[PDB]
Design a protein around this nucleic acid. Structure first.
Lengths: 324, 236
RNA sequence: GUGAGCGGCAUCCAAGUUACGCAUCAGAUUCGAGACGCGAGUAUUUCCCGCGCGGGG
């Protein structure tokens, strides 16, 4: 059962690509040596094949949010906003291992390595939450397929299709954001400011001498990081392998309450803020201005409510239990 | 190749001569080698060197500044500035001293036309007769151009920077004159020039020195910043 | 004129048939492009210095 979510971000998305890439001024990637050089944090990109109105296929980088990040975002949103209040209403406490397993798919770095009994397999897969994601010490295959957040772009036509060709963007959608780190030494101009500091101006000057002598690290740093520009429209594709009504209702509730969560990175700079523009369920739009609602979706919400009001921590503690 | 400039933010414009006197005064006795190196003294004696000084002082708008020339100048300023900073902190217990450390690359490339270069502080007064010779450009050009050329070549040789063999300079003039003294009670004074404009057919990168007797704080000028032409904002 | 002399190990033959590298994981947290470049000085002198000449306010 395919779910397509049309996501428009009102703040830049910042998913940092691992590695210390260096930039000069005026935004030249990997500049020639000799010029000024600064560490640049490149946004996460995936190379995809697309024809840019030429007819020949070529691989080009595309700034995306990795699918694992979106899967974890969905998991966390579901847990905080739906399941956790349900457990708190019944005053049921999760064990520490159960909490870790529900929040990261496993309670430790050592998988059990042995299979599961069939009754336990079906019990865990029928669960509204554990069935979707799975994991645990003994490995279990979840029902949830989460794809990466592909931006609607001329490079994404060969991937997402021509259904959303009306929202494509031609040019690049990434920009460099420059940041600093200023010492408190510059903003001291009078000892009156330093009335809160031990030893006063003498101690401050001693510290500044230490900084100039033996620290080099220091509290001065001019750096930059690449962000995906705001306002670009994204497509999120979610697939489920033969789910029950309760699981679909849970996913719909998470989508309803997803807007309260950031996508990735830039917590300090309010990065990752988005609004869900359109949700499509098996080729049919179920989104409303209020949210996921309508007669076509009432049964899922009823089923997920009936699952939530009568769920306990027993399933979680059994799932997190290891057979070693 | 590299020029290091360090500025101490004391909060008031102090003339370079008194600045050098006081920095000498603070380091009396402690670390004698640092004193001998910073004061440009022959090892074993307190006399100064006639040779071009690798230690440089200048009058910052907010205080006084130390300038090192070459690797030796850079090394001496590097191991010196913490000591002078500590001494200044010791003497001024209720003021924050701030240190600004910036390096300039030194480069001099030829150029088939001339550019407007000026300095706030020239030592041009040698004889009183030559002082009145400035009315006519022809009479006063010879010694001024000779001074500029010799100063440039000697500082280049001191820093080991290649210079073209075909430098010709013509003088334009200065804004006014000023008087300077060893001490406020001294009765001996010299005449300098402010805004001494001369045109050279080459590029001067970084901060530069012209004239002679520079350690006391004369003849320093940032030719690179002057090329930006920020001298327009001078009005009341 | 060596118990010598003379004398094909040769023909034919299938290593092939079946098997999922798969299941489960947030590149996250922190930091100012704003500060800095002589715009304030108020005129004749000595012991020694590089050495007639070049020099220390």
């Amino acid at each position: 059962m395919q779910i397509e979510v049309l996501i428009r971000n009102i703040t830049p998305i910042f998913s940092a690509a691992p590695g210390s890439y260096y930039v000069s001024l005026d935004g030249t990637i990997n500049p020639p040596q000799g010029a000024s050089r600064f560490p640049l944090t490149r946004a996460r990109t995936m190379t995809v094949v697309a024809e840019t109105g030429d007819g020949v296929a070529k691989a080009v980088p595309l700034p995306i949010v990795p699918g694992n990040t979106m899967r974890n975002l969905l998991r966390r949103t579901m847990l905080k906003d739906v399941i956790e209040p349900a457990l708190r209403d019944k005053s049921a406490q999760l064990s520490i291992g159960a909490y870790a397993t529900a929040y990261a798919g496993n309670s430790s770095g050592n998988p059990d390595g042995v299979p599961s009994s069939f009754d336990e397999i079906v019990t865990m897969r029928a669960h509204p939450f554990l069935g979707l994601f799975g994991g645990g010490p003994r490995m279990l295959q979840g029902r949830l397929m989460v794809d990466s957040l592909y931006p609607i772009h001329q490079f994404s036509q060969r991937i997402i299709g021509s259904d959303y060709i009306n929202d494509s963007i031609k040019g690049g959608i990434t920009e460099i954001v420059w940041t600093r780190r200023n010492d408190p030494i510059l903003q001291l101009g009078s000892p009156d400011d330093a009335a809160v500091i031990e030893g006063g101006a003498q101690a401050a000057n001693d510290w500044i001498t230490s900084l100039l002598a033996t620290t080099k690290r220091g509290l001065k740093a001019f750096n930059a990081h690449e962000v995906v520009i705001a306002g670009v429209k994204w497509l999120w594709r979610i697939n489920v392998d033969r789910p029950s009504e309760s699981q679909i209702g849970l996913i719909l509730l998470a989508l309803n309450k997803l807007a309260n969560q950031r996508i990735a990175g830039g917590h300090a700079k309010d990065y990752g803020r988005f609004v869900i523009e359109d949700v499509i369920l098996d080729g049919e739009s179920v989104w409303t201005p209020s949210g996921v609602s309508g007669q076509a979706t009432e049964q899922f919400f009823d089923a997920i409510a009936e699952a939530l009001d009568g769920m306990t921590s027993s399933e979680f503690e059994q799932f997190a239990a290891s057979a070693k | 190749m590299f020029v290091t400039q360090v500025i101490f933010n004391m909060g008031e414009r102090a003339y370079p001569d008194r600045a050098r006197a006081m920095v000498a005064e603070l380091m009396d006795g402690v670390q004698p080698g640092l004193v001998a190196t910073l004061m440009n003294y022959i090892p074993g004696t307190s006399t100064s060197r006639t040779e071009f000084p690798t230690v440089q002082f200048g009058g910052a708008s907010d205080g006084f500044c130390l300038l090192g020339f070459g690797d030796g100048g850079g090394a001496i300023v590097r191991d010196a500035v913490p000591l002078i900073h500590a001494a200044l902190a010791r003497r001024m217990p209720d003021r924050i001293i701030q240190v600004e450390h910036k390096e300039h690359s030194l480069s001099a490339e030829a150029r088939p036309y001339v550019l407007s270069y000026t300095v706030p502080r020239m030592v041009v007064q040698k004889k009183q007769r030559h002082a009145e010779r400035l009315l006519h450009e022809a009479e006063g050009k010879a010694h001024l151009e000779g001074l500029f050329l010799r100063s440039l070549q000697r500082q280049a040789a001191a820093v080991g920077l290649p210079l073209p063999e075909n430098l010709e300079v013509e003088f334009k003039g200065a804004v006014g004159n000023f008087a300077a003294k060893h001490n406020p009670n001294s009765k001996v004074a010299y005449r300098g020039l402010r805004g001494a404009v001369f045109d050279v057919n080459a590029r001067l990168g970084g901060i530069w020195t012209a004239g002679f007797m520079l350690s006391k704080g004369y003849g320093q000028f940032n030719a690179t910043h002057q090329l930006s032409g920020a001298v327009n904002a001078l009005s009341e």
